[PDB]
């Protein structure tokens, strides 16, 4: 279709096509949800396993004591973004000894990823990011798409079949501010469980949790750390 | 790629197209006489709105090196600016050789930034250069890709073929005095469509005394009695 | 309406295809054809028919028309031709 | 394209019984270069009908109606 | 999509761009080098001989590139000029570094290395020019080398590089005799082969440019044979031709 | 389709494949071990009456204990020789112990791999083979394919006729026929002599006797060894 | 192909990219006239202002390049502004490097050289804006020049540029062929009647913006509404 | 399409989908991570007897406590292995301790795609404070912890067989024989000691060659 | 186009830049905005489509603050819009650092416009997919408001609109009588105009981001207090 070949070129109908394809990179990835609260931010990621022998890969990456991210999409240029965000947060720590507020971090990421969308020979960073942070204004959840247009969210999910999780989060999002840590985590767990097909179900080995709160620095819970949250699942696959 | 490029199996297709463009249409004859060299050219401005004392086709690159050109005047400027800088750099390095004719061959050779480094798009102008600081005159041609040709008489216009035929038939010859400029004007006449006049025709002469672009007064004087 | 598809034989489908094809020829099912069914992941029904044809061809190449107890030779020809199909 | 029909004006006007009426919507953007002499020239003003024209056209519309 | 040059292989595995350039070197230009004891000489064919030139450069094909050698191009003049400049620069850089004239083989290897680089890496055209070199050194004496645009030079002693190079080299093989070869008989052979490869018999001395390198008393002299000497050579050749033809 | 230094849809690297097939265009080259002497031959059949045979240079020295043989593009091979020689001298400069055959071959292979990497550089269409006595007595022989790799062989058999000559070598690569230096030489002959007519003097042998300099076999002695091989061929009716 | 797509010479021996770029100037719907006079040089362009929400204060196409040089642009406004900025930079840099103010011809020459560089090479593209710059030069009288997207800088006495530039040039040719010098009134009236005959709208004294440079009064007077109205009243009298 | 950077119209950029399917032309290699250690087995697949078997090596020790088995273009494997060695040595020199196999794999993955992408898959195995570990790194700079991995032309069949022959509480002695029988079933020829290489990982040993033509004690049982 | 609309460096046969002609289409497709120069200041306004209620309170706001007294209301491709806003912030900071005081709006618009034009001139880089108003006020220079299209140049605007429905907005803008109406009633009227423009007729619910600058704010371009402009939104609703 000619006009879809390159990122620089612009489609006659309007928006370019390579960027629109870049979002399909995050569409083609394991599901992840992330929700705010009055006081905590929680990420639930479906650790996609290659085979039963291999491990379920790593998701919910660690950035700083108060910020943790969840990737969904092209893993190659995702550890790169993780390095960039870690470096910026450490730079802020180094210059004025304060945790870099998430919104400033997300704006930095957006500006950093915007340039490859306009520079020839540079592919856009086709990685979906779910940043969970705790700045001074309570927990924050941000979604970063490869089109470099970030969003703030009360609760957002990205990945394969993530629309069902989105719908569940929307329908239950009214009761999100007033939820205990375990209640919110189980909300997220139900949302993620509603994504994968009915044959699949949540296991301690195929899920990861990222929790960041006012007094709780960012922590990545799993299997053993996860079981206490996985209890009371209310399983309706 | 970013040089003089596009050479297929036994060809230089881009250079050949550049020469097709340098076919041009400004006759710009040149004659190497015994006393000196004459570079004459046709300034046939569209309408009377344009001016003739504003822009020139003949440029003195230095004290006794004069230069005339062909199609693609915008490229020719840049080329003559580069040539002036090159002659000046040579004169600055080899200080005070009053270098014109022992420099005419050298500047024609340094006309390799001319084309051997084309600049993605090669230059589209072929230029004749005249010099007389050796006790002998020199007329050279540099073409959009080649090099110094060392002519005795030639033309680079739309009818350069019959212009050169006219030059050889009218016997460019070797005993011709400096006033072979009459023959140069005759050669132009052939490749000219109009009652040529002083502002219409621009001519420079480079004799052993130096180089000089003839003013409309002298050009009209020569055009009278033709 | 009613768009349906398959062409995705699993172990059970592949071994049932082996059974229906081995109904032909002079073969019997005392061969451990489940081993070859496992050996080829998603080898259609066309390739299973092809492997049965190759087994018969190997039998006639050996000039033995017997294929009911010709099971080790069955397995050998099927596995070598699976090798060839994957990389020849 | 209109200048094409403009230079057509030498289409034997003496010989040819052909005119051209330009029924534009609004004379606002009409290329004032096309209103010089030798151009379309004449323009007649037509607007929404006044009360008199309105009642007259109502009468002629009701003409075919006999009730 | 953007244009990319061709410095690549063939499905078979050939560098057909380089091969096409090397074959095009045969097209246009004509030079030949003959090596002989106490003198090695180059003959060149003056392609364009229009009467409106003045011949003030004193040399078009033959180029003096060093005190102890001289080359002759047969390619596109645009590349030939820069290649000769680089060759002289290389020779003079060696002279600066070692305070000794550069051996001809080392000079040719440097030049062919630069051409090999030009055909090797980057989106750069191969140098469509093939040139001969005649030289003298302390180690090997008179030497003759032929370099093609492929960068694969070769140490020759009687070769041609022009349009009818096949015919010229066949003539050289037929009438070449090593050892006995001397400067004068080398000149006779060179003019004879040039007359063969240039269809018009009785070649004018203007259409032929020849330069001989000789070893004087501890000093290399590279003399470009001027018009009178060339046409006297032509006259002697003509006498030989008439005698041989009539004696039958 | 696509024939540049990018991965093809089926894998492989087609430009590298073309370069590897290019060596065919070239000359045969054989060489053997033997713990007493390493000898390698090229065999050239094409020297017109007017060209000087000195500057063919099908086999050359690196560090007076290592010799390499051309197979493929002569210009690329010569450039590789020059660079390898420079690096050999550098490894003499640093690490004062002389160069090892494996080290210089590794350098050549790394250079070839570097040139195959990236689109800009043509992948050096020359397959080389390097032999020679190491510092610790053992004479070795490696063959480096143009792509990136080297392999320690007992017989190389690279170039035109490679398949047939390698089959001949592996058919009767007898160590009891290796034994003495003359036995090694006569084994390299009648093996390289098999390729093409090899009648008068096409064979171009080369010898590295332990700590001696690179010995280039003299033509009369080469005819002598051919006559000896003929004598062995005789009395075998 | 790509003869007509990139700035390369056509096989027929033409340059199609600049040939196209000249038509870009006609694109945009505007015209401009410049008349040199006995002592002054007056230029005028129409001011096409669609809807009055714009600021007629800043919609102009004429600018001061320096204290004595005034320019009128024709073509795409973005490129026009870029070239005006470049010309101002060149004027200031010239005044810095050499003490005396930059002559108008020299300024036009530098702008033309920049445009010629643009039509050279292939990474950039020519700017689609033709610039008519005028100014008083001592020992020269008024001076008018025109730099074009190609690099050909010339143009004198009467020169015009834009959509209907040919008709204006024809009328101005008639006027100049009529041998009578224009004083600081006839020049202005000539320019006004030229542009009016080109686009007969009788030129309400609000839709053109005229710039004037006299000799006794230097500087680029962007003549006000009252001045243009007075000239229009005097002309239509 | 064809551009190394342009994404596919559907979901995922191409030419890396091409680079990943280079282990297909690569040679088969298997690795088992047991509680005892890590067993790394490969096949040399010598093409001609004259080539020294010692020359062909798919398994190289990155350090005393990391071994790597490549499958694919040995040319690219050389560069990746060299970078792994350099990174391991740099980490040891900086922190005066043994760099974790996970950290080494992470560094190699970072260098994997930064130049056309590398077309080799790596099987790192080594001891650490978190017991013996094994990682499968892929041409597309993606790494995954694995307990029993196969890679190469016969990756699918080898991994499928390993999936059912492996159990969570095995030892080195059972791991080696399982890997060898799978290798014999996978390859074309037999598992002669001149054709099969083996690499052992032990908590209290550096990772050395497997007995060297004295490893027939683990193929005679096979 | 077909052949000539691939890189901005390729002119059209008629002499046009189809890359920019297509980049304008993205602005035409994206949601609209509006800005009116009140008598003593400039009032912005832009409807933002809440594509999903999952999003928090109005984020990725089409308004931005490029400098202390200057505000930027942008429409089109939002990511490149934000990058361009960062360019504008950097430009204002650099001007303040060099020449002191505050950057005049006409010069700021001219510099950012020249920067944009630099991005459409070449081939390797592509034109920006955004169009934005820059509004500012000061006592000395009154209130100024310049609109920059994805490739064109700044133009002085009494009132301007950009985005999905430019003409529909501009009709009622020109109906409104500016130049004598205070920024309060203008803040009411801009919301009125946005709500007159379609919000849910074919789309979702829209958020009303409104911006201020003027002597009532002594410069200091700030978002209007949304709590107290909810009643202005109500008046728009009626």
UniProtKB/Swiss-Prot annotation, chain B:
Answer whether the UniProt record assigns the keyword Cytoplasm to this protein.
yes
Q: Could you tell me what induces this protein?
A: Down-regulated by antioxidants BO-653 and probucol. Down-regulated in response to enterovirus 71 (EV71) infection (at protein level).
Quote the annotated effect of residue 103 to V: In a colorectal cancer sample; somatic mutation
Q: Does the keyword Phosphoprotein apply?
A: yes
Keywords of this entry: Acetylation, Cytoplasm, Nucleus, Phosphoprotein, Proteasome
Q: Which residues cross the membrane?
A: none
After translation, the protein is modified as follows: Phosphorylated on tyrosine residues; which may be important for nuclear import.
Q: Which InterPro entries match?
A: Ntn_hydrolases_N (IPR029055), Proteasome_alpha (IPR050115), Proteasome_alpha-type (IPR023332), Proteasome_asu_N (IPR000426), Proteasome_sua/b (IPR001353)
Cross-referenced Pfam families, in alphabetical order? Answer: Proteasome, Proteasome_A_N
Listed under GO biological process in this entry are: proteasome-mediated ubiquitin-dependent protein catabolic process; response to virus
Q: Name one GO cellular component term.
A: extracellular region
- Residues recorded with modification Phosphotyrosine: 17, 69, 114
Record-listed Phosphoserine modification sites: 7, 9
- Localisation per UniProt entry: Cytoplasm; Nucleus
Q: Which residues carry this modification: N6-acetyllysine?
A: 63, 164
Cross-referenced PANTHER family: PROTEASOME SUBUNIT ALPHA/BETA
Q: How does it assemble?
A: The 26S proteasome consists of a 20S proteasome core and two 19S regulatory subunits. The 20S proteasome core is a barrel-shaped complex made of 28 subunits that are arranged in four stacked rings. The two outer rings are each formed by seven alpha subunits, and the two inner rings are formed by seven beta subunits. The proteolytic activity is exerted by three beta-subunits PSMB5, PSMB6 and PSMB7.
What family is this? Belongs to the peptidase T1A family.
The name this protein goes by in its record: Proteasome subunit alpha type-2
What's the name of its gene? Answer: PSMA2
Curated annotation (Swiss-Prot), chain C:
Residues modified as N6-acetyllysine:
85
Question: Where does the UniProt annotation locate this protein?
Answer: Cytoplasm
Consult the record and explain the modifications the protein receives after translation.
Monoubiquitinated by RNF181. Phosphorylated. Dephosphorylated by UBLCP1 which impairs PSMC2 ATPase activity and disrupts 26S proteasome assembly.
- Membrane-spanning intervals of the chain: none
Q: What induces it?
A: Expression is not cell cycle-dependent and occurs throughout the cell cycle.
Subunit: Component of the 19S proteasome regulatory particle complex. The 26S proteasome consists of a 20S core particle (CP) and two 19S regulatory subunits (RP). The regulatory particle is made of a lid composed of 9 subunits, a base containing 6 ATPases including PSMC2 and few additional components. Interacts with NDC80/HEC; this interaction is detected only during M phase. Interacts and SQSTM1. Interacts with PAAF1. Directly interacts with TRIM5. (Microbial infection) Interacts with HIV-1 Tat.
Family, according to the entry, reads as follows: Belongs to the AAA ATPase family.
Chain's role: Component of the 26S proteasome, a multiprotein complex involved in the ATP-dependent degradation of ubiquitinated proteins. This complex plays a key role in the maintenance of protein homeostasis by removing misfolded or damaged proteins, which could impair cellular functions, and by removing proteins whose functions are no longer required. Therefore, the proteasome participates in numerous cellular processes, including cell cycle progression, apoptosis, or DNA damage repair.
What gene does the UniProt entry assign to this protein? PSMC2
UniProtKB/Swiss-Prot annotation, chain E:
Query: Has keyword Zinc?
Result: no
Q: Where in the cell is it found?
A: Cytoplasm; Nucleus
GO biological process terms, alphabetically, are:
proteasome-mediated ubiquitin-dependent protein catabolic process
Which SUPFAM superfamilies does the entry mention? N-terminal nucleophile aminohydrolases (Ntn hydrolases)
Residue(s) carrying N6-acetyllysine? 124, 173
Query: What keywords appear on the UniProt entry?
Result: Acetylation, Cytoplasm, Host-virus interaction, Nucleus, Phosphoprotein, Proteasome
Give the modified residues of type Phosphoserine.
10, 72, 170
Q: Name one GO cellular component term.
A: extracellular exosome
Tell me which domain of life the UniProt entry assigns to the organism this sequence originates from: Eukaryota
List where the protein spans the membrane.
none
| Subunit details | The 26S proteasome consists of a 20S proteasome core and two 19S regulatory subunits. The 20S proteasome core is a barrel-shaped complex made of 28 subunits that are arranged in four stacked rings. The two outer rings are each formed by seven alpha subunits, and the two inner rings are formed by seven beta subunits. The proteolytic activity is exerted by three beta-subunits PSMB5, PSMB6 and PSMB7.
Q: Which family does it belong to?
A: Belongs to the peptidase T1A family.
- What is this protein's record name? Proteasome subunit alpha type-4
Gene name, per UniProt, is PSMA4
Curated annotation (Swiss-Prot), chain I:
Name-wise, this protein is: Proteasome subunit alpha type-3
User: Per UniProt, what is one GO molecular function of this protein?
Assistant: ubiquitin protein ligase binding
Organism of provenance: Homo sapiens (Human)
The taxonomy runs: Eukaryota, Metazoa, Chordata, Craniata, Vertebrata
Q: Does the keyword Cell membrane apply?
A: no
Domain of life of the organism encoding this protein: Eukaryota
Concerning PANTHER family, the annotation shows: PROTEASOME SUBUNIT ALPHA/BETA (PTHR11599)
Q: What induces it?
A: Down-regulated by antioxidants BO-653 and probucol. Up-regulated by bacterial lipopolysaccharides (LPS) and TNF.
> Which PROSITE patterns does the record cross-reference, listed alphabetically?
PROTEASOME_ALPHA_1 (PS00388), PROTEASOME_ALPHA_2 (PS51475)
């Amino acid at each position: 279709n000619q006009y879809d070949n390159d990122v620089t070129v612009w489609s006659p109908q309007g928006r370019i096509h390579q960027i629109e394809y870049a979002m399909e990179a995050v569409k083609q990835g394991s599901a992840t949800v992330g929700l705010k609260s009055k006081t905590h931010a929680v990420l639930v990621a479906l650790k996609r396993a290659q085979s039963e022998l291999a491990a379920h890969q790593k998701k919910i990456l660690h950035v700083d004591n108060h910020i943790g991210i969840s990737i969904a999409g092209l893993t190659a240029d995702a550890r790169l973004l993780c390095n960039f965000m870690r470096q910026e947060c450490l730079d802020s720590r180094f210059v004025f000894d304060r945790p870099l507020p998430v919104s400033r971090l997300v704006s930095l990421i957006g500006s950093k990823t915007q340039i490859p969308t306009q520079r020839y020979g540079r592919r856009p960073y086709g990685v979906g990011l779910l940043i969970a942070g705790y700045d001074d204004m309570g927990p924050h959840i941000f979604q970063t798409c490869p089109s470099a247009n970030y969003f703030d969210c009360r609760a957002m999910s990205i990945g394969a079949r993530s629309q069902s999780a989105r719908t569940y989060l929307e329908r239950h999002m009214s009761e999100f501010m007033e939820c205990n840590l375990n209640e919110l985590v189980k909300h997220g767990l139900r949302a993620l469980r509603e994504t994968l097909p009915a044959e699949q179900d949540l296991t301690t080995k195929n899920v990861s949790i990222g929790i960041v709160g006012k007094d709780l620095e960012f922590t990545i819970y799993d299997d053993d750390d996860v079981s206490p949250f996985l209890e009371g699942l209310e399983e309706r696959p | 790629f970013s040089l003089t490029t596009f050479s297929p199996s036994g060809k230089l297709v881009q250079i050949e197209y550049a020469l097709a463009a340098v076919a041009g249409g400004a006759p710009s004859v040149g004659i190497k006489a015994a006393n000196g060299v004459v570079l004459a050219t046709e300034k046939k401005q569209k309408s009377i709105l344009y001016d003739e004392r504003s822009v020139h086709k003949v440029e003195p690159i230095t004290k006794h090196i004069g230069l005339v050109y062909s199609g693609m005047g915008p490229d020719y400027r840049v080329l003559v600016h580069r040539a002036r800088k090159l002659a000046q750099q040579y004169y600055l390095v080899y200080q005070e050789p009053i270098p014109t004719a022992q420099l005419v061959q050298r500047v024609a050779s340094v006309m390799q930034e001319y084309t051997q480094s084309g600049g993605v798009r090669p230059f589209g102008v072929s230029l004749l250069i005249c010099g007389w600081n050796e006790g002998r005159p020199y007329l050279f041609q540099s073409d959009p890709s080649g090099a110094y040709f060392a002519w005795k008489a030639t033309a680079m216009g739309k009818n350069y073929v019959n212009g050169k035929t006219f030059l050889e038939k009218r016997y460019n010859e070797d005993l011709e005095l400096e006033d072979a400029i009459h023959t140069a004007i005759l050669t132009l006449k052939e490749s000219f469509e109009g009652q040529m006049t002083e502002d219409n025709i621009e001519v420079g002469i480079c004799n052993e005394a130096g180089f000089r672009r003839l003013t409309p007064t002298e050009v009209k004087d020569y055009l009278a009695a033709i | 309406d009613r768009k349906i598809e398959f062409s995705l034989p699993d172990l059970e489908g592949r071994t049932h295809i082996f059974k229906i094809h081995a109904r032909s020829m002079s073969v019997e099912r005392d061969i451990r054809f489940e081993l070859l069914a496992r050996l080829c992941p998603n080898s259609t029904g066309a390739e299973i028919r092809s492997v049965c044809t190759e087994a018969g061809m190997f039998a006639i190449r050996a000039r033995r028309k017997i294929a009911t107890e010709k099971d080790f030779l069955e397995a050998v020809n099927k596995v070598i031709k699976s090798y060839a199909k994957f990389s020849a | 394209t209109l200048m094409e029909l403009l230079n057509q004006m030498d289409g034997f006007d003496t010989l040819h019984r052909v005119k051209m009426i330009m029924a534009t919507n609004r004379p606002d953007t009409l290329d004032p270069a096309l209103l010089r002499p030798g151009r379309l020239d004449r323009k007649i003003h037509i607007d929404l009908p006044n009360e008199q024209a309105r009642l007259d056209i109502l009468k002629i519309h009701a003409g075919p109606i006999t009730k | 999509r953007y244009d990319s040059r061709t410095t690549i292989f063939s499905p078979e595995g050939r560098l057909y761009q380089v091969e096409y350039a090397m074959e095009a070197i045969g097209h246009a230009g004509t030079c030949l080098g003959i090596l002989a004891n106490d003198g090695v000489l180059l003959a060149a064919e003056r392609r364009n001989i229009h009467k409106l030139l003045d011949e003030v450069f004193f040399s078009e094909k033959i180029y003096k590139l060093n005190e102890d050698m001289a080359c002759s191009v047969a390619g596109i003049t645009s590349d030939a000029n820069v290649l000769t400049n680089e060759l002289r620069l290389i020779a003079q850089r060696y002279l600066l570094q070692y305070q000794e004239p550069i051996p001809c083989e080392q000079l040719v290897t440097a030049l062919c290395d630069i051409k090999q680089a030009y055909t090797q890496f980057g989106g750069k055209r191969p140098f469509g020019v093939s040139l001969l070199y005649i030289g003298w050194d302390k180690h090997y004496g008179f030497q003759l080398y032929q370099s093609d645009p492929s960068g694969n030079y070769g140490g020759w002693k009687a070769t041609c590089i022009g349009n009818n190079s096949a015919a010229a080299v066949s003539m050289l093989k037929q009438d070449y005799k090593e050892g006995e070869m001397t400067l004068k008989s080398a000149l006779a052979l060179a003019i004879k082969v040039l007359n063969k490869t240039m269809d018009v018999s009785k070649l004018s001395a203007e259409k032929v440019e020849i330069a001989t390198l000789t070893r004087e008393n501890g000093k290399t002299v590279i003399r470009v044979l001027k018009q009178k000497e060339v046409e006297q050579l032509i006259k002697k050749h003509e006498e030989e031709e008439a005698k041989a033809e009539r004696e039958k | 389709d696509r024939a540049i230094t990018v991965f093809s849809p089926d894998g492989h690297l087609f430009q590298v494949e073309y370069a590897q097939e290019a060596v065919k265009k070239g000359s045969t080259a054989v060489g053997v071990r033997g713990r007493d002497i390493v000898v390698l031959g090229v065999e050239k059949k094409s020297v017109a009456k007017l060209q000087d045979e000195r500057t063919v240079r099908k086999i050359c020295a690196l560090d007076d204990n290592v010799c390499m043989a051309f197979a493929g593009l002569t210009a690329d091979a010569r450039i590789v020789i020059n660079r390898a020689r420079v690096e050999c001298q550098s490894h003499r400069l640093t690490v004062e112990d002389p160069v090892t055959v494996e080290y210089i071959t590794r350098y050549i292979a790394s250079l070839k791999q570097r040139y195959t990497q990236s689109n800009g550089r043509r992948p050096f269409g020359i397959s080389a083979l390097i032999v020679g006595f190491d510092f610790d007595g053992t004479p070795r022989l490696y063959q480096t394919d143009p792509s990136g790799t080297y392999h320690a062989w007992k017989a190389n058999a690279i170039g035109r006729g490679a398949k047939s000559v390698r089959e001949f070598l592996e058919k009767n690569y007898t160590d009891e026929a290796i034994e003495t230096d003359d036995l090694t030489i006569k084994l390299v002959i009648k093996a390289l002599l098999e390729v093409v007519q090899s009648g008068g003097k096409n064979i171009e042998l080369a010898v590295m006797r332990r700590d001696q300099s690179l010995k280039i076999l003299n033509p009369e002695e080469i005819e002598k060894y051919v006559a000896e091989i003929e004598k062995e061929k005789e009395e075998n009716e | 192909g790509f003869d007509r797509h990139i700035t390369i010479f056509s096989p027929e021996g033409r340059l199609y990219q600049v040939e196209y770029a000249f038509k870009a100037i006609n694109q945009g719907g505007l015209t401009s006239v410049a008349v040199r006079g006995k002592d002054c040089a007056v230029i005028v362009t129409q001011k096409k202002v669609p809807d009055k929400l714009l600021d007629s204060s800043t919609v102009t196409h004429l600018f001061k390049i320096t204290e004595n040089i005034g320019c009128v642009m024709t073509g795409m406004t973005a490129d026009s502004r870029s070239q005006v900025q470049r010309a101002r930079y060149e004027a200031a840099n010239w005044k810095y490097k050499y003490g005396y103010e930059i002559p108008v011809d020299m300024l036009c020459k530098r702008i033309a050289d920049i445009s010629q560089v643009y039509t050279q090479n292939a990474e950039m593209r020519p700017l689609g804006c033709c610039m008519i710059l005028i100014g008083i030069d001592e020992e020269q009288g008024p001076q008018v020049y025109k730099c074009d997207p190609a690099g050909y800088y010339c143009g004198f006495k009467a020169t015009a540029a834009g959509v209907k530039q040919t008709e204006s040039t024809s009328f101005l040719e008639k006027k100049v062929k009529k041998k009578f010098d224009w004083t600081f009134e006839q020049t202005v009236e000539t320019a006004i009647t030229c542009l009016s005959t080109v686009l007969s709208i009788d030129f309400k004294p609000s839709e053109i913006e005229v710039g004037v440079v006299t000799v006794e009064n230097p500087k680029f007077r962007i003549l006000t509404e009252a001045e243009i109205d007075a000239h229009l009243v005097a002309l239509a009298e | 399409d064809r551009g190394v950077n342009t994404f596919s119209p559907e979901g995922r950029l191409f030419q890396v989908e091409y680079a990943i399917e280079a282990i297909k032309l690569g040679s088969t290699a298997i690795g088992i991570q047991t509680s005892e250690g890590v067993c790394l087995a490969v096949e040399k697949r010598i093409t001609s007897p004259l080539m020294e078997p010692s020359s062909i090596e798919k398994i190289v020790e990155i350090d005393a406590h990391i071994g790597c088995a490549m499958s694919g273009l040995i040319a690219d494997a050389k560069t990746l292995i060299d970078k792994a060695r350099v990174e391991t040595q740099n980490h040891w020199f900086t922190y005066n301790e043994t760099m974790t196999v996970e950290s080494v794999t992470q560094a190699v993955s970072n260098l994997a795609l930064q130049s056309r992408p590398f077309g080799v898959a790596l099987l790192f195995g080594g001891v650490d404070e978190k017991g013996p570990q094994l990682f499968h790194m892929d041409p597309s700079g993606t790494f995954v912890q694995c307990d029993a991995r196969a890679i190469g032309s016969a990756s699918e069949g080898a991994q499928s067989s390993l999936q059912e022959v492996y159990h969570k509480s095995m030892t080195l002695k059972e791991a080696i024989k399982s890997s060898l029988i799978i290798l014999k079933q996978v390859m074309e020829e037999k598992l002669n000691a001149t054709n099969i290489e083996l690499a052992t990982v032990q908590p209290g040993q550096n990772f050395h060659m497997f007995t060297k033509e004295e490893l027939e004690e683990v193929i005679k049982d096979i | 186009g077909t052949g000539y609309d691939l890189s901005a460096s390729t002119f059209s046969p008629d002499g046009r830049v189809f890359q920019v002609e297509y980049a304008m289409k993205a602005v035409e497709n994206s949601s609209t905005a509006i800005g009116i120069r009140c008598k003593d200041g400039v009032v912005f306004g832009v409807e933002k489509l809440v594509l999903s209620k999952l999003y928090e309170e109005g984020s990725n706001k089409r308004l931005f603050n490029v400098d202390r007294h200057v505000g930027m209301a942008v429409a089109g491709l939002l990511a490149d819009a934000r990058s361009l806003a960062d360019i504008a912030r950097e430009e204002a900071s650099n001007f303040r650092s060099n020449f002191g005081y505050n950057i005049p709006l006409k010069h700021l618009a001219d510099r950012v416009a020249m920067y944009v034009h630099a991005y459409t001139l070449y081939s390797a880089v592509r034109p920006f997919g955004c169009s934005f108003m820059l509004g500012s006020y000061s006592v000395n220079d009154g209130a100024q408001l310049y609109m920059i299209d994805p490739s064109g140049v700044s133009y002085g605007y009494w009132g301007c609109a950009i985005g999905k429905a430019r003409q529909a907005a501009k009709t009622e803008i020109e109906k409104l009588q500016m130049k004598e109406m205070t920024c309060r009633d203008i803040v009411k009227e801009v919301a009125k105009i946005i709500y007159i423009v379609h919000d849910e007729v074919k789309d979702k619910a829209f958020e009303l981001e409104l911006s201020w600058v003027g002597e009532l704010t002594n410069g200091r371009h700030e978002i209007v207090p949304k709590d107290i402009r909810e009643e202005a939104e109500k008046y728009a609703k009626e």
